Design a protein around this ligand. Structure first.
Ligand SMILES: [Cu+2]
Ligand SMILES: [Cu+2]
Lengths: 129, 129
């Protein structure tokens, strides 16, 4: 139902959710990302980035090149639907986005853009009723 | 006996050895790194890099900026005692170095300098006793 979801990231380099569903009644959707580990952001920071599935690699690449001060996301990347900041163990961050950016029936990829994390930290997001 | 060791790396971002000992009877030592997972190097490439414990973070930071083609290790890095190339699943690489670069009693760190892997893929190397 409600237009929110909580996802956990840890020191093992995993998310705890592999799929997220945004209910069709939602106009706004909020993702709460938590880092439940204890490692520093420079060593094991995590974020949550949303792109079309297609755009995964590219956004990941450019993000890595953007640096930590940019939360490992190329500024103004248009391929990026929404993203959180990079957070370390014990922290959390939230992002709220307009559902209208998503198109029904389409596949969206969410992943962590911190260097090298995208390969193990990825999931699918979809709009459904 | 031998002045050689095999160390495995996998898709879970781990090495299978946490510590390595080089026998004092050795003049040279060879490390054979194997990537026994099935991920490709662009997503989960691994290397093996040896430095003094203290040069870890810096070598890693800078190897990261050298890129894949440079095996994620800055060329001519004086802090690097030895390193293999970056390999992907189903591949192996070997590196041999002089034992005399080592100092009896000292703990050296070995780790994977591929983006983001250092936090998890790290161990200790030293001389026999
Ligand atoms: Cu991450
Ligand atoms: Cu690695």
């Amino acid at each position: 139902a409600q237009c929110e979801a909580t996802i956990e990231s840890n020191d093992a380099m995993q998310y705890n959710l592999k799929e997220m569903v945004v209910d069709k009644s939602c106009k706004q959707f909020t993702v709460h990302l938590k880092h439940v580990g204890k490692m520093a952001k420079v060593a094991m920071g995590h974020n949550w980035v949303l792109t079309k599935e297609a755009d995964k690699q590219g956004v990941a690449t450019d993000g890595m090149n953007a640096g930590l001060a940019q939360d490992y996301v190329k500024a103004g990347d248009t391929r990026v639907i929404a993203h959180t900041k990079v957070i370390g163990g014990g922290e959390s961050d939230s992002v709220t986005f307009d559902v209208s950016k998503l198109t029904p029936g389409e596949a969206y990829a969410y992943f962590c853009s911190f260097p090298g994390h995208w390969a193990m930290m990825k999931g699918t997001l979809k709009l459904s009723n």
